[PDB]
């Protein structure tokens, strides 16, 4: 029906269920809903019914037409700053569960290192965005940003690669019945991150970058 990006950016709370399990409306945002419902054996399109259910909600803030400077400032305060505060704690929660519940079978061994790699990668990527690309866009130089953007999108793909590993390491970030408090809450912080981290890349890859390259 509609592109994955515009579907999550028009509907106030589609992004949530529109993520469900294995829905990539971020880096592959311009992909059509038919494709996301093609390779992934989804219902023919009752999704649209799900979309129509919450399509009645009023309009909040359609970033599609918002100024690029507001989009940037929004990402810096809502997503960039958030990740820098979430991942350090997850690294500490991972190394505790990997140590405390090591005797368990379903322990997500290696979770602490994959989280650390994602933390290393992201921090490097955001710093580049905030010091190289975002300032370039605010000055109105978006048309010449093919190089810098094309470089950041490659780093977006490396980030997703790490999310899938973290997903697989945690059995689709789903804890077992033996999960104590420091094991369940952690998986919640992981789900919180993927949400904030999918919407983060969705806004950068489907709105900021194309409009900037479009000279808007
Ligand atoms: Fe970013």
Numbering used by the authors: 5 to 220
Article excerpt on this structure:
Escherichia coli YtfE is a di-iron protein of the widespread Repair of Iron Centers proteins (RIC) family that has the capacity to donate iron, which is a crucial component of the biogenesis of the ubiquitous family of iron-sulfur proteins. Bacterial RICs are composed by an N-terminal ScdA-like domain and a C-terminal domain that folds as a four-helix bundle where a histidine/carboxylate di-iron type center is inserted. In E. coli YtfE, the best studied RIC protein, the center is coordinated by H84, H129, H160, H204, and two μ-carboxylate bridges formed by E133 and E208. We show that YtfE establishes protein-protein interactions with the scaffold IscU, where the transient cluster is formed, and the cysteine desulfurase IscS.
However, in YtfE-E159L with a neutral leucine instead of the glutamate, the metal site lost one of its iron ions. The structure of YtfEM-E159L contains only one iron atom in the metal center that is located ca. 13 Å below the channel entrance. In this case, the channel is longer, with a length of about 16 Å, and although the channel entrance retains the circular shape, its diameter is reduced to ∼1.5 Å. The channel is also formed by hydrophilic residues, namely by the ligands H204, H129, H160, and residues E125, E162, and L166 located at the channel entrance. In YtfEM-E159L, the absence of the second Fe atom, the different position of the H129 sidechain (mentioned above) and the presence of leucine in position 159 modified the channel arrangement so that the substituting L159 residue is no longer included in the channel. Additionally, the conformation of ligand H129 differs from that observed in the other two proteins. Specifically, the side chain of H129 is ∼7 Å apart from its original position and no longer pointing toward the di-iron center (the closest distance to YtfEM-E159L H129 is ca. 9 Å whereas in YtfeM it is about 2 Å). Moreover, the structure of YtfEM revealed that when E159, that establishes a hydrogen bond with the iron ligand H129 (H129Nδ1.E159Oε1-2.66 Å), is replaced by leucine, the position of the neighboring histidine H129 alters its sidechain conformation, pointing away from the center and toward the protein surface. Interestingly, in the YtfEM-E159L structure, no such hydrogen bond interactions are present, probably explaining why the B-values in this domain are higher than in the other structures. Thermodynamic and kinetic data indicate that mutation of E159 generates a protein with a more unstable center that releases iron at a higher rate. The mononuclear iron YtfE-E159L mimics an YtfE protein following iron release and its structure shows that the process implies the movement of one of the axial histidines that exposes the metal site cavity to the exterior, thus making possible the re-entry of another iron atom to rebuild the di-iron center.
